[PDB]
Design a protein around this nucleic acid. Structure first.
Length: 159
RNA sequence: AGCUUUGCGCAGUGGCAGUAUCGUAGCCAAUGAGGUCUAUCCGAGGCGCGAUUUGCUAAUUGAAAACUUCCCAAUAGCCGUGACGACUAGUCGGCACUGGCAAUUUUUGACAGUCUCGAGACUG
């Protein structure tokens, strides 16, 4: 709604002169007297068993005030984050360029916009089977992203 | 959380500040100011006009260099002498001075300088 009001250097300079003049006058007088849409990303990594990388991902999720989950399974790590656009962009730039995995590769499965946040805080869930992770994702209403990540992992393993 | 890029105003230093700079209530703008470059062209105002804050303090000239009373006329002990009284020609107490008060015991200065651990010594 509001627009930024910028001026040229000369105009500013005139203001400075006036400002200093006013200041001098005063001095001389003192001496003389996440709502409306939240960005939700979901990335798929081959191996997330490293404690240092998981701690760095948890620190990047907690410092950016973004919620979500990090589910681990048999060669399928689904990291879902949700928050603002700048926090999601910083998390994607950290997980795509700063977080060095290497046969272990991390790629972003999906990145969209939702109405509100689903999870409360970043909880590192763990499940050896995919049915428990699917039930944990459906308990918070995010089973479609986990199913899409599992289908993308199956298509990457088959092809 | 640290760090970095950049600008404004403000704070500090430095720097220039009569080819130094702003002011404009004038005038032509990134739809485009204005090229002699580059005129399928650069891209910023063009070029007029109006001119170069405030405060401290010194110094100079002059009779006087500006901070809220002059002047007059004037001012705010002794030795002796003459009377008076007292005590036996003398003495005492008070009054004024018709003369004096720089020559050893009193008031016209034998004073000054230097040194040592209240005291002493040396010199002129």
């Amino acid at each position: 709604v509001t627009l930024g009001v910028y001026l040229t250097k000369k105009e500013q300079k005139k203001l400075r002169r006036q400002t200093r003049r006013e200041a001098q006058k005063e001095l001389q007088e003192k001496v003389r007297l996440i709502s409306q849409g939240v960005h939700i990303s979901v990335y798929r990594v081959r191996n997330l068993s490293n404690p240092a990388k998981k701690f760095k991902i948890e620190a990047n999720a907690g410092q950016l005030y973004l919620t979500g989950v990090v589910v681990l399974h048999k060669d399928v790590n689904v990291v879902v984050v949700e928050g603002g656009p700048k926090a999601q962009k910083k998390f994607k730039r950290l997980m795509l360029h700063r977080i060095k995995w290497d046969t272990n590769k991390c790629v972003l499965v999906w990145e969209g916009t939702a109405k509100d946040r689903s999870f409360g805080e970043m909880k590192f869930k763990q499940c050896p089977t995919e049915n428990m992770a699917r039930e944990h994702f459906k308990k918070h209403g995010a089973e479609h992203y986990w199913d899409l990540a599992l289908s993308e992992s199956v298509l990457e393993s088959t092809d």
